[PDB]
């Protein structure tokens, strides 16, 4: 409807897969060659399902802070035989809160869902699901079951996926340039 949507649409329309695990289907952000991210939650196996095709895990990395503190972000590496458009030069290189960001799922559920979430805070701490995270991002939108793994962008800036919410609350680890330097 408006630049934010447009940017949005750019990433989901080339840098997405629907991810299947045993505990459900994520949108999935491709970011360069056959890395992508899920949350940490989807527990990432040895094999995984990209768009119904049986996909080996050549690497899953569950990322947590210095402070041995879950971030809630896997790194995976796709047994794929296709890359993505590198994005790196889109992610944040420092935390930060952000004005009119866009959340984007695509899934069987929600195929081609755009959602303005508006003001994004820098919240820091969160115990999600009894586990402590640090870099949550907040965003004053009532999120539901099946967004988990969607994309949160500004204008210009990939920052986010989106990782839970409280029925009132969504939240969103964040996405920094430092994740994925090869
Ligand atoms: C599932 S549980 O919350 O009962 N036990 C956990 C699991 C994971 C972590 C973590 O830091 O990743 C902490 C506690």
Do not use: W
């Not at 040895?46 to 990395?61: G, K, M, P, Q, S």
């Not at 919240?123 to 099946?146: E, V």
Request: hydrophobic letters at 40%; proline letters at 4%; one cysteine or more.
């Amino acid at each position: 409807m408006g630049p934010g949507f447009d940017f949005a649409q750019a990433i989901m329309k080339k840098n997405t897969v629907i991810a299947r695990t045993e505990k459900g289907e994520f949108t999935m952000l491709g970011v360069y060659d056959r890395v992508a991210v899920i949350p940490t939650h989807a527990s990432v196996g040895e094999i995984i399902y990209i768009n119904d095709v049986e996909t080996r895990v050549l690497d899953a990395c569950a990322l947590r802070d210095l402070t041995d503190t879950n971030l809630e972000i896997t790194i995976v590496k796709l047994d794929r035989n296709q890359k993505f458009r590198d994005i790196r030069h889109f992610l944040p290189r420092c935390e930060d809160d952000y004005n009119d960001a866009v959340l984007s799922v695509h899934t069987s559920k929600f195929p081609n869902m755009y959602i303005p979430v508006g003001q994004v805070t820098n919240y820091g701490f969160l115990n999600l699901g009894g586990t402590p995270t640090h870099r949550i991002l907040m965003y004053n939108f009532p999120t539901r079951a099946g967004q988990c793994g969607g994309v949160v962008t500004t204008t210009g800036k990939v920052i986010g996926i989106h990782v839970g919410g409280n029925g009132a609350q969504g939240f969103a680890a964040m996405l920094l340039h430092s994740y994925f330097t090869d």
